[PDB]
């Protein structure tokens, strides 16, 4: 038998309990794995049983809850279940430019835009999902769509205006 351990932060405990009934149900009716929510160590234990096949799905089961740990939506997390080749890449904002204080706060603003329109446009065009931490940016999607979204995200934080990135990323969508 094999077992995986998944940490959960204290800020992620509230939506984990609120969206709990739609998390273990795909594990039991379609995946055939037993899970438990260890309150004492604040870990999610996933382990095999006598009812499991398709040993490739164990790693996918670990990547299922890890996506919800980082802040992705539930329906975006089950999108990892039914697809087979999806990867997640993360990087900090200051991994590409030293930004301090007010400049760092405006870097997050240019990624989102008014009402998240700039993020949603990149989300809709590259067919990926982007979530924003305090300084980290996590992108989930197919490998070629990651490099297209990472190129648009980096050009946003260089200071190229969101109008130019909105216009350019729709022309690149024709390939």
């Amino acid at each position: 038998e094999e077992t995986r351990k998944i940490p959960v932060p204290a800020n992620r405990y509230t939506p984990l309990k609120e969206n709990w009934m739609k998390i273990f149900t795909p594990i039991v009716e379609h995946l055939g794995l037993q899970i438990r929510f260890n309150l004492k160590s604040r870990n999610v234990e996933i382990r095999t049983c006598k009812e499991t096949k398709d040993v490739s799905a164990l790693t996918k089961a670990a990547d299922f809850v890890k996506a919800f740990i980082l802040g992705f939506q539930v329906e975006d997390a089950l999108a990892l279940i039914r697809l087979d080749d999806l990867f997640l890449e993360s990087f900090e904002i200051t991994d590409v430019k030293p930004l301090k204080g007010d400049h760092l706060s405006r870097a997050i603003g240019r990624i989102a835009g008014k009402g998240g329109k700039t993020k949603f446009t990149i989300e809709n065009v590259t067919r990926t999902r982007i979530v924003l931490a305090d300084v980290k940016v996590h992108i989930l999607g197919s490998f070629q769509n990651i490099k297209m979204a990472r190129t648009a995200i980096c050009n946003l934080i260089l200071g190229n205006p969101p109008s130019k990135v909105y216009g350019n990323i729709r022309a690149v969508a024709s390939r």
Binding site: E75, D76, L78, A79, L83, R127, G141
Partner: peptide, 25 residues
């Protein structure tokens, strides 16, 4: 959803289009 969006971008829409073309006693 991401998987709904991908599968919609992988398959073809079909279905609704109505084309209007064209004895006892």
């Amino acid at each position: 959803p991401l998987a709904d969006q991908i599968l919609a971008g992988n398959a073809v829409r079909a279905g609704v289009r109505e084309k209007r073309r064209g004895e006892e006693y």
